[PDB]
Amino acid sequence: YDWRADWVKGFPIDSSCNATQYNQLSTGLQEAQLLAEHARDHTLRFGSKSPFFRKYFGNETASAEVVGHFDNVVGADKSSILFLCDDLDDKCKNDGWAGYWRGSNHSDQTIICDLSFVTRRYLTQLCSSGYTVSKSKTNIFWAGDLLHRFWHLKSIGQLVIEHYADTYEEVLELAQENSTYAVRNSNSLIYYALDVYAYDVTIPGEGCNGDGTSYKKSDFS
Amino acid sequence: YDWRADWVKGFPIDSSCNATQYNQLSTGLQEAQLLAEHARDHTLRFGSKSPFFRKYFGNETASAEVVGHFDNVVGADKSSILFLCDDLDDKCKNDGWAGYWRGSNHSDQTIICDLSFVTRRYLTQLCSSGYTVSKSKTNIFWAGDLLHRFWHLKSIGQLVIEHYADTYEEVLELAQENSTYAVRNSNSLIYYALDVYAYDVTIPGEGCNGDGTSYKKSDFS
Amino acid sequence: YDWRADWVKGFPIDSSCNATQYNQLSTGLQEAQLLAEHARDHTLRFGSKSPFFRKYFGNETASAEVVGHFDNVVGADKSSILFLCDDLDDKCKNDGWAGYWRGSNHSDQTIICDLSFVTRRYLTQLCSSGYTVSKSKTNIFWAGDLLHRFWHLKSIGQLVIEHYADTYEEVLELAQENSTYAVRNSNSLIYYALDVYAYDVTIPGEGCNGDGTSYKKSDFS
Amino acid sequence: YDWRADWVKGFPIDSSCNATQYNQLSTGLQEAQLLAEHARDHTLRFGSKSPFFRKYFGNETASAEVVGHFDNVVGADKSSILFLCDDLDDKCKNDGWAGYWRGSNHSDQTIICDLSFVTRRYLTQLCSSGYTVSKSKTNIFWAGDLLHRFWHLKSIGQLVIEHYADTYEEVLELAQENSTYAVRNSNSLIYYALDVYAYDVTIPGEGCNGDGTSYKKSDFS
Amino acid sequence: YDWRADWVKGFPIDSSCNATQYNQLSTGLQEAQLLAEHARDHTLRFGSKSPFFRKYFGNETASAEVVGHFDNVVGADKSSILFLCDDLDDKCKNDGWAGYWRGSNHSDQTIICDLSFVTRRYLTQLCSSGYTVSKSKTNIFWAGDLLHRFWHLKSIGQLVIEHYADTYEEVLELAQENSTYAVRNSNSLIYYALDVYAYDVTIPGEGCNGDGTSYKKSDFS
Amino acid sequence: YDWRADWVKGFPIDSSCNATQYNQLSTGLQEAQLLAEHARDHTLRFGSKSPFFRKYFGNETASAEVVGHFDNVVGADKSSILFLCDDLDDKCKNDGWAGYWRGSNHSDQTIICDLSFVTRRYLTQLCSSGYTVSKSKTNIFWAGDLLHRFWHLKSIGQLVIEHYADTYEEVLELAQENSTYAVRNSNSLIYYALDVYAYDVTIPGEGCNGDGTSYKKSDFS
């Protein structure tokens, strides 16, 4: 039983979406996977010696679950997940809703409404038009929004990631008070992934955190 | 700061070892890393749909920490770690000792005595001469012994992997009674790695467990 | 004189642009080059046997200058061209402008204004939100807008590409009446490139021309 | 319709040529394409900056039709072209005839007589035995002889390349007098290709023109 | 007739051996082939300019048969050769027998008994535990044991390689007395291969000959 | 001592030859080496099962020296060999002399006269214009003549290849009478190498021996 020839590592898309919607959903999913892979590599290279790990997860925490989450996002068997473009539950009629989760009856199914195709931006436009990681909402780009949607599925989240703190300040206090629960928090992982990507690639050596802190090479050891 | 050029992903060896000791220690270390890589790939492919995972870690456990442990073993920064072939602390004099951990003063160093160079075996002789995973000792091969030595180091173990169960029966009971401490038990990880390697590579489809269980393709779904 | 070692086939950018402007200008330039490359490949493969070539350049025209223009764009030498983000001529105050050519004194420099970073789009959103090649303006996307700035330059334009017909109807009339000037007209080449890219990649077999004409495999022979 | 899968870029040979005829003619046919590829690369790299372009096509002529002419030979569909070794029109009897074009009835077919397999030379022997580019006939080698046959075919010539000047002096006068017809003149292109190959590959930095001119690196700018 | 497709360059193994025996026999065979390849490369690089060649084959001998033998071992047609794990002649009952050749009736077949799977070593342990090329037996390792079996087969030995001198002293005397017969001698070839591998790879610059001699770079000229 | 980075496997040419003699001598040497490589591959694949081996070397001869000679020609250290275009011994004044060996004073030097650049053919014209391996001279092509010159050097011939039979009939009789001496005969090796190449590459399945024998696939077993 060669299981290396049956391994699917990309997110499937249903046939409800036409060519135009498929073209942009594929790019968004690929960008989300690229962000997750970079976060995994940064964690593996540094650990708790980097100042970004120490401020989102704890001063002396172990980096095993953190790398495992992004490893599951990057490489795993996505043979049951399906993304649909059809409103099968009558919920896109709400205000400001760009998608939703089908629930417990269909735990590996997600629906995308038409607001996503007009409001979401791409990774080449990061830290532009006044965007900052700590003062803007995390769902402005395709990568952050789709990462947030990934934690709901049964094959990725596995019913352990939840919402314990949502605002930036609450995330910062969770990092220092309850270090066990701030590795399974939805917002901490997305903040970390968005913060370490703008420091290595977008603006090397500076980033766009926008909260009044600057990190040098001497802080990484 | 281009940190992708300073990344060292192999285990450094000291100069106390002459040519014929280096020749064998390097091969042993490479085999241990290969075993870790295969275990991580199997876990990512299957998760809790595998009978081996289900029997060593729990019926409905989440696979995020096992993947992280094996990924830390495979790829991370091995710059502070050193393997020595010199008896600085004078402990190789004991009977049946093939090495030891230098302690809390030097938490990233370990000593290899001369017994390792006359007793340890290679991965091509697995499941031969009457060897079985569940009835023989785990340190007979280079890969298992070196995996056991890896968990002691501060840059890999991170002071979370301990000895909660040592025998096969205790390992099987702890997987069903206390599934939170099983993902950080030393022997459970090595048993899982050896079992899945013997099932996938050495004797494809049968394995060499030796306790009256046979698994088919229908048990993986 | 090994001239293959100092051959530059990419458009250089000045140091007056910061990181965020560089990140988007580079992507726009690469997209324009990719569009030109696809147009050249389609022309070489088919010639006057394709209906797009026939409708934009003439029924029995020869395809040599058309191939040469796109080949000059893709792979000429670009060591004296510069793109600047600095307003050195006080021309940004005019309403609606997104950039301009520096003139005949400096016949190889172009200035990109801050309006280009708010409105231009990317190739993955082609034929969406009601965009049609026939009825919309050519400078909505990065590639179509940047390709028209290349014909102004001395190295690429060579003072032979001019404005002989601007609207869609005039472009369609020039192709049939004056076939000699059609291959040197600025808008005809951009229309041809956009049409063939939309037909071959974005929506395979349909395109998004939006003027009531549909082409099948039998028109290509 | 995937038109990149059935793209033919070599010249087909009929079954009337036996083993040795095929062996020699295929090599002769590929050498001409190599010559055309080098000429195209030189034109793209320099343009009117090189002193070889200026003396054959004009002091300030634009280089797009030349690039297109050579790129048509290098890469284009050749599925309708056939080379035959059979004398069907009863013409391989005139003195000094090495082949002929089948005419307007079959405008994509060529016949090769038996003098070609006795009197044609290869590119490794260029500029030897007293051969000079300007003082010798242009059909002494396989590449130069096949290039002028390529211009007669409907698919590569397209009824635009003719004979407006045949000797070296007339070729040199046409460049300065009538620059519009120099770029579609049969002999100027072959002279240019031979010159730039001999200058760059055969005798690097000198060439074998043999007319009393020497060009240095200072002339190329 | 394409004879390059049905070309077998590895040694086939029969179905009498189960998985455990197959796993070790294949590794031994590939190690023997690697040793032969290194010996051929050393001979090609140096010839009679190396001190090992002059002492195993003669001071002024020609290296043609020597390189031919190892080239035959490395790459040839091993299509009629078979290795079996069954005892079809009842000869493994003798003491100290690790295998035998099936004889003249079956000239391309050989039997492997069970001692081979308990007493043979690997190339990573060369020159260790007191092993010495000059003083130990040549059949301790898999490679040196299988090389001696290769000379018995009809298609690798071809009825010319025999036993003329067995001990080290006899080999050293035959080298200088009869240089014609010491190029088709089993032990001479095996000793030469083991020595040039141990000098070049295992302990670079020193080797493990263990007979009171040592060579430097000044002896290779 | 890394001797793999100091390995020269091509034939050096002096600076006496100008730009146009180097171009042809280099190609001739490459073609000779390619012919030797093909002969080695044919010998390795078949041995004494092919009818070409059996008629030139013997009905049941062993193929070790034959493969070693061609292996020495293909890959060895050509660091003391030199080819010169300057007449130092005043011997080209003879008639029909295309080169000569410098003698025992300089055992690794060869001189090429000017007939070689006027009367030598290439491998793409084999079996053409009435050439047959059996009835024509062996020094008509670059490959055969240079192969003949290689056996004189002390680093390749090694003072064992001589002239024992020169005509085709004597060569045919030597194989049946004295098989020991027809493996170090100069003309037998050249006749074998030309014949197997003509049969395999030039005219697949037939060849151009021109003697009255035709070999089928059933003769190779």
Author numbering:
A (entry chain F), B (entry chain E), C (entry chain A), D (entry chain B), E (entry chain D), F (entry chain C): 31 to 251
Authors' own words:
To further compare the Zn2+-bound structure to Pra1 in the apo-state, we collected cryo-EM data on C. albicans Pra1 in MES-NaOH pH 6.0, thereby ensuring protonation of histidine residues and release of any zinc ions due to electrostatic repulsion. A comparison between the maps of Pra1 in complex with Zn2+ and Pra1 in MES pH 6.0 at the same contour level suggests that the His 178, His 182 and His 193 triad no longer coordinate the metal ion under low pH conditions in the absence of zinc. The lack of metal ion coordination, and the change in pH, does not lead to global conformational changes in the resolved portions of Pra1.
In this study, we present cryo-EM structures of C. albicans Pra1 in the apo-state as well as in the zinc-bound state at 2.8 Å and 2.5 Å resolution, respectively. The structure reveals a hexameric ring-like assembly in which each subunit is related to its neighbor by a 180° rotation.
